[PDB]
Amino acid sequence: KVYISLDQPLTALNLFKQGLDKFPGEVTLLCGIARIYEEMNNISSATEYYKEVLKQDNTHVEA
């Protein structure tokens, strides 16, 4: 949130991938990555990350 407030998507994405390196399959982190990719409007990666969320949750209302 802090990094998105300072308009720094590519810092937030690196931080999210660091977190996923810590927590290997977290759903909120993958969903945040997908939200950032959709705000930047490149859906071809937001669909991939929502599909990862699905592979983890499969009931996720957002993805």
Partner 1 sequence: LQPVFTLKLRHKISPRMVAVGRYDGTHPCLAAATQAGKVFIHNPDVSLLNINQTVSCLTAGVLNPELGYDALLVGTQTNLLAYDVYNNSDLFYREVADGASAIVLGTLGDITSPLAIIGGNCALQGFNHEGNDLFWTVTGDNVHSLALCDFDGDGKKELLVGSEDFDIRVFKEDEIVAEMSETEIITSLCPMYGSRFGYALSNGTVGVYDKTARYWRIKSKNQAMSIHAFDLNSDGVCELITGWSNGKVDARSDRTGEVIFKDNFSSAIAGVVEGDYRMEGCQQLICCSVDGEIRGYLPIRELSQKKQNLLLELRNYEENAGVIPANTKHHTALSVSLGAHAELCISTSNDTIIRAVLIFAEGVFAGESHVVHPSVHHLSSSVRIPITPPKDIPVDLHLKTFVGYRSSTQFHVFELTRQLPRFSMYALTSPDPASEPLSYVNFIIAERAQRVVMWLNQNFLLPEDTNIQNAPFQVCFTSLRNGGQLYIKIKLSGEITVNTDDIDLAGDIIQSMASFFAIEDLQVEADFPVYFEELRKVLVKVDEYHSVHQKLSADMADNSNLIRSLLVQAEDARLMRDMKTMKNRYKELYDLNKDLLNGYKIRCNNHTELLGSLKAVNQAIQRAGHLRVGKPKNQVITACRDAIRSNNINMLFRIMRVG
Partner 2 sequence: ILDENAIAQVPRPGTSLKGPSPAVRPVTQAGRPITGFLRPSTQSGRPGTIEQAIKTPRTAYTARPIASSSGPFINLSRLNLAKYAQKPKLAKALFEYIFHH
Where does this chain bind partner 1 (CB under 8 A)? 8, 10-11, 14
Phi/psi of residue 24, nearest 5 degrees: -65, -25
Give yes or no for residue 43 binding partner 2 (CB under 8 A): yes
Query: Which of 5, 21, 58, 59 lies at the binding interface for partner 2 (CB under 8 A)?
Result: 5
- Where would I find the beta strands (DSSP E) of 1-63? none
Give yes or no for residue 28 binding partner 2 (CB under 8 A): no
Give yes or no for residue 40 binding partner 2 (CB under 8 A): yes
Rounded distance, CA 62 to CA 16, Å? 18
Rounded distance, CA 12 to CA 18, Å? 10
* Contact set with partner 2 (CB under 8 A): 4-10, 36, 38-41, 43, 61-62
